[PDB]
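Closing statement on the A1A7J sub-project.
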Amino acid sequence: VNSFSGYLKLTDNVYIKNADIVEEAKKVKPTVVVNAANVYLKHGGGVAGALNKATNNAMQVESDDYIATNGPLKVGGSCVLSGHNLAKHCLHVVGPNVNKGEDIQLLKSAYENFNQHEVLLAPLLSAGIFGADPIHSLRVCVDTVRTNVYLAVFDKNLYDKLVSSFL
Ligand SMILES: NC(=O)c1c[nH]c2ncnc(NN3C(=O)CC[C@H]3c3cccs3)c12
């Protein structure tokens, strides 16, 4: 039994809510919040910009040090950094950005990173401003992640569409 409230059960291990992941993080303080990152950990907009803003830019400062030491991530890859005031840890996961011309088949690899953590609060990878089909992303999530995932989808119309079309 955990502290997530109001989530709609989709499968054995996947749940969903119409909420801002940032506000969910401030309320639950989960062990792991997932960031929808890019390979440079440049947190300008989307989920990343919103999370980073909520940390008063501390996420970006930490991320710049990480990149200076380790270089960029891979598309489909991840790294674990601090969750700052929002969670114990932040798992920065790079889904492919179709609007940048990145390869859609890498979305499954991106979701595989979730399996290294027992419970996660997460956004819908590669959707929104990342340009991929959100129905496809939810499908890949449910078919790839085996650990317990609490998905927050900010857009109300999209949330309703995702629930109503889910198989
Ligand atoms: N400014 C924002 O994008 C958000 C701020 N809080 C959020 N909490 C949940 N989801 C959000 N965005 N996203 C969707 O609505 C579906 C896809 C997902 C995205 C993932 C990567 C880029 S956008 C946001």
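The longest helix spans residues 58-70. With this model delivered, the sub-project is considered complete and its resources will be redirected to Aim 3.
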